[PDB]
RNA sequence: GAGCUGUAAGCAAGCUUUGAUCCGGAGAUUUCCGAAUGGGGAAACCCACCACUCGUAAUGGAGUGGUAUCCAUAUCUGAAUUCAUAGGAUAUGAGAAGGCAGACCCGGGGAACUGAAACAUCUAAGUACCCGGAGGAAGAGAAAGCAAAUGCGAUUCCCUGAGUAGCGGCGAGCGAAACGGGAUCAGCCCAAACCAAGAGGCUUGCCUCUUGGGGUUGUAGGACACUCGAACGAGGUAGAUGAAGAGGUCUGGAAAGGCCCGCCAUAGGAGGUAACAGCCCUGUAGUCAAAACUUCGUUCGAGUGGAUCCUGAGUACGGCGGAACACGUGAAAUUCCGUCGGAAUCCGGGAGGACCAUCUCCCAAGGCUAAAUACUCCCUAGUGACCGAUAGUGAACCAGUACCGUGAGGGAAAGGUGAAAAGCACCCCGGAAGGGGAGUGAAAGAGAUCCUGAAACCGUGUGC
RNA sequence: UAUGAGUAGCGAAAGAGGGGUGAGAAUCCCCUCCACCGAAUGCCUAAGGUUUCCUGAGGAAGGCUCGUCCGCUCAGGGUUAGUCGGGACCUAAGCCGAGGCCGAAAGGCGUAGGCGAUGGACAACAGGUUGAUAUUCCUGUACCACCUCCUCACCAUUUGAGC
RNA sequence: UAGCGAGGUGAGAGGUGCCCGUACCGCAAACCGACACAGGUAGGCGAGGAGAGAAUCCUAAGGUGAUCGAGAGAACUCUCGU
């Protein structure tokens, strides 16, 4: 995927359009990611052995990976992603500036 | 196998034909005679068509 | 073959626990293992003396999980009686 | 790992194989009795044995050629 | 190149930038049954012998390997029987066996319904089917040909000839070929004289057989005489890189849509993304890439004479009986089979649709041979005025399943929550099922019997 | 999906009451008396079935009603052999069948040799025990084959015991 | 007997003894009959009274009360009695 766990991204599509957050988890198999503070859901959980209160709980639900873009290091605007090789090691680059993301 | 050990002659299919030209299946048998001959320099009773014996090249033992 | 190929696991049931009072130990064994091989293996592994081995075959139980029918594995159970002058397993 | 296993002699491997098969046996018993916490260990030992038997067999093939 | 431990949630325990999971090349392991092959057997089981090894005091037990049959080869034995042979034993064999495309191919065997407005010749049809043999193709093939020209020059296949010529209870029907135009093109090796060497029978110097040379044909030729493993390149099997808008704004749960503006384009294929995206993602065009295995390509002994001799024999051919030829026994050439008879051999032989003569063209009775052609169980990429869940495969789904049948065999039904499980905490009636609220959601009359939700059919209410 | 229709049927048979369990009881459990089979409707055991067995829990469907129950659902559990039956023993009919004989092919037949119980042969009995096995486990008392680290007795090492 | 044969024979003592089946139903609601179906299903044992008896009727050991019931007691139909 063009983003990965730990990347700062901007949500470019959905109810959370224009909201930035960190990727808390990636789901390559589903092409979804979990972004902090984005796409919150109210899960109605019964009492279990783990959580014996139960209750309604606000948690992030994952969004499609194509609805987030990484931010340009220089300008702080969304960027498409390229790849160059530095020190015999491939790195992502912000196509907007040229700056390395990671 | 009813086959000549020299020539390979064997039973072959074809028709009877009546005067009314009705066809029914029959066979033609080779005129095989069981006879002692050398088969790999070993005397053995094998089937040989009369035709293969006609010359006298196939020598009985 | 290794002795530890022969014995698979102990059988822990109420029956098996009652037999352990009589100095009889129940194991599941390799379904190919004859009772001599089991005797040899129990003496080799645990350093005990075996009086007798009795042995039985269980068929697989037919089973269901939702819409899919199948069959548990065949089992060979050995009941190993140790001699009276012997260490316990 | 196999890189480390290849440094050993065949006899030394065959001892480690014997040692691991004892470990596997004991784990299987602990699992049966419900004592074993680290169940992941079973898989590791099985694959260790496999790794070793692979190295042994590579040497047999290397010799018998 | 950052996640992963499949479906499959979940807990659990772990793994992974000291490179995991994952993808490709090459290996290793690969229980038992199955040709199944140590012997047996009701497949997936049982029972052995021989080595060697573990274990036992020893028996019993365990492990590894070997042990089918037939064929070929070699060796050793050599019955009745003297030699001998049959037979036996041993060893060596990546020798055979079996499966499989429901296809295509070549053979052996070979129907009937049906048509003929009945039916027997005839048709259906050399079809279906069974059997044998294959090969990636097969078969055919280098003139004893076609023809009747100033000729042609192996075979196969396509077009055409032509529904012609013909065959035909001259009925029903069956039905060519050559010429001409194309596809593709390629030619060769023996047998025989004869020579050399060797062995064998000596028949007693004649003949036989093995090996090598020789030789290969038609207005003849020949013999026989004389004369001159690597290297590199492009592919395949993983991949890499890859332009351009969260443009503003409207509606909306969400914008890829509207409106107003930009931009890229060797890229406006495609799929995805909360509604319809060249510019969001995966990609696409283009350009690159391989340790390994693999495919393809590229490079690194002749004339002139003709005394003789040779040139495929139980053959060609013929009679009788059948079959194949488009051709049904006919005026019946041509090809093959069974049976019996049986040539010539260059001063020779075959064919030109009975047959003869003349002429013309050929040289049989030995073998090999690519391409053009056929087909698709598969794999890769793609396409469709093809189907869209009673359709399309029998099978969109755990289907050749369930179920039926002793068996061969027959053979279904069954797709759709939502963008996301956010899959309804909590309260209330109820044993539960199921409801009513409350929540979630754009929607719950989307709550799993979950898109839409017709009709039949079943109800409740009531205006006449 | 109707109609027929709340209709035909609910598959030979003796129950009654008291108590219990439970949301619920003609139908489940217990008790009592009554009744039925008894050359069986009892006990054992083939074939066949294949977990239906035992225990605990369950009640949607199955059960011609009901259901708290069940041959049903879900969990666990349960089958112990030198001596029983079968194999490592024997053969019958029949079947397979090295070579072989016969046959368009496929194959058919068949010898040596095998396979093949429904038969022959062959060593364990009584008692006890579990929720669920018992000539199998346990107790007691046996028997059969084979083996020799050992013991004793006897016989004999080639007109030499023994097998 | 042919053979084999230098060690044997007998009795103790010690020891060795594998695989497959074993649950449960089995005149049955578990098998064959599409059914928890008045049918079919080889064999062993099969008590007492009266009796020739395995008949018969009533019982023993043992097993069972049968998977819709409650009424009413018409026609008619069935099976019975007079
Ligand atoms: K006909
Ligand atoms: K998107
Ligand atoms: K002829
Ligand atoms: K003719
Ligand atoms: K269908
Ligand atoms: K009676
Ligand atoms: K119950
Ligand atoms: K036995
Ligand atoms: K039993
Ligand atoms: Mg891009
Ligand atoms: Mg047993
Ligand atoms: Mg075998
Ligand atoms: Mg007709
Ligand atoms: Mg060919
Ligand atoms: Mg890219
Ligand atoms: Mg929509
Ligand atoms: Mg010739
Ligand atoms: Mg003519
Ligand atoms: Mg539909
Ligand atoms: Mg369909
Ligand atoms: Mg069946
Ligand atoms: Mg609606
Ligand atoms: Mg929709
Ligand atoms: Mg709907
Ligand atoms: Mg009524
Ligand atoms: Mg009623
Ligand atoms: Mg009526
Ligand atoms: Mg009525
Ligand atoms: Mg009624
Ligand atoms: Mg009843
Ligand atoms: Mg029960
Ligand atoms: Mg009911
Ligand atoms: Mg027996
Ligand atoms: Mg036979
Ligand atoms: Mg044979
Ligand atoms: Mg018997
Ligand atoms: Mg006995
Ligand atoms: Mg019992
Ligand atoms: Mg029993
Ligand atoms: Mg019955
Ligand atoms: Mg009877
Ligand atoms: Mg009586």
Question: How would you describe this structure to a colleague?
Answer:
This is part of a larger assembly, with chains A (102 residues), B (61 residues), C (89 residues) and D (65 residues). Chain A has 102 residues and is mainly beta. Chain A has one domain. Chain A is 0% helix and 42% strand. Chain A has a five-stranded antiparallel β-sheet with strand order 6-3-2-1-7, with no helix packed on it. A two-stranded antiparallel ribbon of chain A has the order 4-5. A two-stranded antiparallel ribbon of chain A has the order 8-9. In chain A, a hairpin with a 4-residue loop joins β2 and β3. Chain B is mainly beta and 61 residues long. Chain B has one domain. Chain B is built from one helix and four strands. Chain B has one helix at 50-54; strands at 12-17, 23-28, 32-38, 43-49. The longest helix of chain B has 5 residues, at 50-54. Chain C has 89 residues and is of the alpha+beta class. Chain C is built from three helices and six strands; from the N terminus they run αβαβαββββ. Chain C has a four-stranded antiparallel β-sheet with strand order 1-2-6-3, sandwiched between helices. Chain C has a two-stranded antiparallel ribbon with strand order 4-5. Chain D is mainly alpha-helical. Chain D has one domain. In chain D, 80% of the residues lie in helices and 0% in strands. Chain D has helices spanning 2-5, 10-33, 40-63. In chain D, α2 runs antiparallel to α3. The radius of gyration of chain D is 14 Å and the shape is elongated. Chain D starts with a helix and ends with a helix. Chains in contact: C-D. The C-D interface holds C 2, 4, 7-10, 12, 45 and D 21-22, 24-25, 28-29, 31-33. Bound molecules: potassium ion (9 copies) and magnesium ion (33 copies). One potassium ion is lined by residues 13, 64, 66-67 of chain A. Chain A binds three RNA strands through β4, β5 and β6. Chain C: One of its GO terms (biological process) is translation. Chain C: Belongs to the universal ribosomal protein uL23 family. Chain C: Keywords: Ribonucleoprotein, Ribosomal protein, RNA-binding, rRNA-binding. Chain C: Part of the 50S ribosomal subunit. Contacts protein L29, and trigger factor when it is bound to the ribosome. Chain C: It comes from Bacillus subtilis (strain 168). Chain A: It comes from Bacillus subtilis (strain 168).
